[PDB]
């Protein structure tokens, strides 16, 4: 037989185990709140023809008064935020910022570090295993939308097994031409364009006619608990900036195109439940990093 596996699900690296206590979560929540204040102060200062709103907002963030002949980089909070991002990504990171500094920075605002107030929908499509018989070719392309192209060069019809994992909630399959799909040991229905499947039901079997290649378009939605202040638009921008600025350039780690791929890949690992908690905290840390870097480019 043959096996095809989604590219982004291959060997997720272990995440960090530091800065996960209640104090560190408050620090990440505090940083996100004060980073948002920096963006708004810059707008308000621009509309008021004065610099006082930005100076006061930067003083809370950096614990230092701005000066005309000094470089503004965010101060101590910017350094600690950068270091905790490095620690979260890999277990081989040094994790240098001390605990006393974390508590000092976490006391600036009174925000509860609750990471399970709300939820978010992630659109990565998990294809753990596609099993095909001999003399058939199957290729998987895409992460947000998975395009599975199968060609049957055999004499008769072929049976292909799809395994979508047991984590995603709903998967919707659309084919170029109508095709047949059914569960294990179930009757095959008439050919249809669209199928809605629950991955917990079991492996699904598709029938490949010998005539022409068939392409199946897969879209999936998964629910992950996140804090209320989670914004996927800000998180995705923060992920790219952190990768560009070399916060993930530690040896023996995997690189992902987006944050949705990152969180889904570690969700499917053996200890995925414990990994997702750390990944969510990194998402809020990445959200704070994006706003702070946009208000204070370097």
Supply 168's token pair. 């995603």
Question: If you write DSSP's letter for every residue of 21-60 in order, what string do you get?
Answer: SHHHHHHHHHHHHHHHHHHHHHHHHHHHT-SHHHHHHHHH
Interatomic CA distance for residues 169 and 127, integer angstroms: 13
Which one of residues 1, 49, 100, 190 is an interface residue with a second copy (CB under 8 A)? Answer: 49
Residue 254 interacts with a second copy (CB under 8 A): yes or no:
yes
Q: How far is the CB of 281 from a second copy (least distance, A)?
A: 15
Q: How far is the CB of 34 from a second copy (least distance, A)?
A: 11
CA dihedral 171, 176, 177, 182 (to 10 degrees): -20
Which one of residues 110, 155, 187, 252 is an interface residue with a second copy (CB under 8 A)? Answer: 110
126 closest CA partner among 276, 264, 293: 264
Q: How far is the CB of 104 from other proteins (least distance, A)?
A: 4
Which of a second copy, other proteins, none does residue 100 bind (CB under 5 to 8 Å by kind)? other proteins
| CA 17 from centroid of its chain's CA atoms | 18
Report strand pairing: 170-183 vs 192-197.
Answer: antiparallel
Residue 176 interacts with a second copy (CB under 8 A): yes or no:
yes
128 closest CA partner among 264, 293, 273: 264
Residue 159 interacts with a second copy (CB under 8 A): yes or no:
no
- Pick the piece of the chain touching other proteins (CB under 8 A) from 212-220, 255-263, 273-281, 286-294: 273-281
Residue 90 or 217: which CB sits closer to a second copy?
A: 217
The CA radius of gyration of the chain, in Å to the nearest whole number, is 24
Longest dimension (CA), the chain: 78
Footprint (CB under 8 A) of other proteins, residues 3-32: 14, 17-18, 20-23, 26
Which one of residues 20, 95, 128, 221 is an interface residue with a second copy (CB under 8 A)? Answer: 221
Footprint (CB under 8 A) of other proteins, residues 66-105: 91-92, 94-101, 103-104
């Amino acid at each position: 037989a043959n096996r095809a596996t989604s590219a982004f699900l291959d060997n997720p690296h272990p995440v960090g185990v530091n800065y996960v206590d209640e104090g560190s979560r408050q620090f990440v929540a505090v940083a996100e709140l004060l980073a948002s204040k920096l963006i708004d102060s810059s707008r308000e200062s621009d509309e008021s023809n004065s610099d006082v709103p930005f100076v006061q907002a930067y003083s809370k963030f950096a614990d230092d008064n701005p000066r005309h002949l000094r470089v503004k980089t965010g101060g101590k909070m910017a350094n600690a935020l950068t270091n905790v991002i490095r620690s979260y990504y890999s277990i081989n990171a040094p994790a240098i910022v001390p605990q006393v500094e974390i508590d000092r920075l976490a006391s600036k605002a009174t925000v509860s570090g609750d990471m399970y107030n709300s939820y978010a929908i992630f659109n990565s499509v998990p294809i753990v295993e596609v099993l095909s018989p001999a003399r058939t070719t199957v290729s998987i392309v895409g992460s947000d939308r998975a395009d599975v192209t199968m060609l049957n060069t055999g004499a008769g019809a072929a049976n292909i097994t799809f395994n979508f994992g047991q984590i995603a909630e709903t998967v919707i399959l659309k084919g170029s031409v109508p095709f047949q799909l059914a569960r294990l040991n179930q009757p095959m229905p008439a050919a249809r364009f669209t199928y809605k499947l629950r991955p917990l039901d079991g492996p699904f079997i598709v029938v490949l006619p010998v005539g022409n290649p068939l392409v199946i378009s897969a879209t999936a939605a998964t629910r992950i608990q996140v804090p209320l202040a989670f914004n996927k638009a800000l998180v995705e921008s923060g992920f790219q900036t952190a990768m560009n600025d070399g916060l993930f350039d530690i040896q023996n780690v995997n690189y992902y195109s987006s944050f949705d791929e990152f969180i889904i890949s570690q969700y499917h690992a053996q200890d995925g439940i414990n990994r997702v908690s750390t990944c969510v905290i990194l998402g809020l840390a990445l959200q704070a990093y994006d706003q702070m870097r946009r208000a204070l480019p370097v």
